[PDB]
Write an enzyme that holds these catalytic residues in place. Sequence first.
Site: not given
Ligand SMILES: CCNc1cc(C(=O)N[C@@H](Cc2ccccc2)[C@H](O)CN[C@@H](C)C(=O)NC2CCCCC2)cc(N2CCCC2=O)c1
Length: 370
Positions: A32, A213
Amino acid sequence: EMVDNLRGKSGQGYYVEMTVGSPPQTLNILVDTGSSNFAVGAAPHPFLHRYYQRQLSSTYRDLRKGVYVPYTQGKWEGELGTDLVSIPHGPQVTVRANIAAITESDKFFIQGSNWEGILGLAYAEIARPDDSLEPFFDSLVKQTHVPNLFSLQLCGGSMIIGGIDHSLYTGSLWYTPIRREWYYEVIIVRVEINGQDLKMDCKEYNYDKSIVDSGTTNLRLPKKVFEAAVKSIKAASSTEKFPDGFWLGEQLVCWQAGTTPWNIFPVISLYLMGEVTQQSFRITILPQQYLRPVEDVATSQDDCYKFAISQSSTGTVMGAVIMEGFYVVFDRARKRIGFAVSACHVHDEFRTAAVEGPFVTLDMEDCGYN
Ligand SMILES: CCNc1cc(C(=O)N[C@@H](Cc2ccccc2)[C@H](O)CN[C@@H](C)C(=O)NC2CCCCC2)cc(N2CCCC2=O)c1
């Protein structure tokens, strides 16, 4: 030996095998570039096939501090500690790194994804609880002789740690500056849909930041840019009409197997700031990238897709759908991101994904939002 060390898909993420603890516990870890915390499932969960057992690791050290991390999709909380970490199909080194042991979570782990943890490859500035929690890649570089760079070829795929594998791309590598070291923040200077400029003040493309990202699926765009883009994509594809729900990602579109009308959908070109004043280069992506296949045996008389461009109130996110088919070099040492056409570029017999330049703008405006 690092080629093809990734498994996964844009929808559920790409992951690499790692071990944590002594003796080594093997876990699959999502790669990530959009966060900076290294965290692993560390308690039973319905969607976890396995998890990190701190009690079995003699090298585990508890930091006696909890941490909470919210993403766009999902959130978790855990206990901070450190332990030994290796990457079986990466550099043959062992580093002591910070690890968050996830003990509670909501909508984070994905049913049938095959990963149990996440590797935040971005900078300390966005780590939780704060920037004193050193990220994994920084620890790797400090403790080993690994060069301060990695590259991602998302297709399966490869993460080349410490360098660039020339057998993974063709043509030239074009570099855009990392504007600020927190996310991998870049600047978009121009957007075209089938060669037609969206004609927006370029700051709008980067309100209020633009990032690369690997952990997000979609290309996510600021509302104003999203609306303009959808309008143009609708116009280009108007030989067929789809329900509003499709354009909102609330609904699949399906065609009889093998008949997807790729040619009615436009190419999208994102122009990225170059390393020289008023110069840029573009990456062009095809509908095969931004119409994401949704696998489902129940629907398999058809091929069905979700529209993988969506809106954002926190700036542009160039997610996995954009990175796929490109070789992306995160050159931390020189504060730049490189793009080249990947050995696994998609394309059909008419069109191809591309990275090309230079282009010049007559407009002197800074496209950075802040
Ligand atoms: C791959 C799974 N799909 C998928 C995952 C995310 C998502 O939130 N991925 C995170 C990892 C993840 C990977 C797998 C499962 C959950 C999270 C990334 O870290 C996102 N990166 C930035 C935008 C963020 O919010 N960083 C934070 C900032 C605050 C401190 C911590 C890091 C978003 C979508 N989305 C949402 C709307 C459209 C889209 O594609 C689809």
